[PDB]
Structure 1
Amino acid sequence: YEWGVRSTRKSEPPPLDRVYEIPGLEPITFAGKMHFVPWLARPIFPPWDRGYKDPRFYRSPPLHEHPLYKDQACYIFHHRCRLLEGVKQALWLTKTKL
């Protein structure tokens, strides 16, 4: 079993036009214009990326590409961390005596 309903998930993209499957001519599309049109096949734009940086509009790198990334599955503790057992878990993690 898996969570996430298909209707709630991102809608599947439309099927690619059959004109692109004819290697290889110039598929006429509305890319020349600047608005959606029913007729005329759909174009395929390239991946656009902004040059300069913007504070509010900034996309961080992936989880792996970082200035420092360790493979050891480390663990950190903070105030919000609510332990399960309680005293015994803290004693084990600290190596002390009660």
Structure 2
Amino acid sequence: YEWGVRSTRKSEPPPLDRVYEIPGLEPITFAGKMHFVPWLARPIFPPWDRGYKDPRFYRSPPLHEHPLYKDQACYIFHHRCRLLEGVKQALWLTKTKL
């Protein structure tokens, strides 16, 4: 059972125009215009990257790039960590008598 549902996930983009599979001319796309066009072909824009850094719109890097990314996954504990067993788990994690 795969949880996700195709309708909820991101809709698959349409198939690329058959004009780009011809090696190799300049497909007349609507890139010259600054608005969607029904006729003509669809271009392939490059991945735009913002030059300056905006705190209100800043994207963080992935987990594969970090200053102190360690391989040994350490399990932290905070007030929200609701244990399952109870006092025995805390006694085992602390190594103390009750």
Q: Same fold (TM over 0.5)?
A: yes
Quote the offset at 1:5 in angstroms: 0.8
Aligned to 1:75: 75
Q: Deviations 1:12-67 (Å, cap 9, x if unpaired)?
A: 00000000000000100000010001101001100001000111100000012001
Output the CA distance in 2 between the equivalents of 1:5 and 1:62. 25
Backbone CA RMSD of aligned residues: 0.6
Structure 1, unmatched stretches of 5+, are: none
What SS does structure 2 have at the residue aligned with 1:61?
coil
- Relative to the length of structure 1, the TM-score reads 0.98
Aligned to 1:31: 31
- Relative to the length of structure 2, the TM-score reads 0.98
Output the CA distance in 1 between the equivalents of 2:88 and 2:7. 46
Output the CA distance in 2 between the equivalents of 1:13 and 1:86. 50
Quote the offset at 1:77 in angstroms: 0.2
Q: Quick one: percent identity of the two aligned structures?
A: 100
Output the CA distance in 2 between the equivalents of 1:15 and 1:64. 31
Output the CA distance in 1 between the equivalents of 2:87 and 2:67. 38
* Number of residue pairs matched by the alignment: 98
Quote the offset at 1:73 in angstroms: 1.6
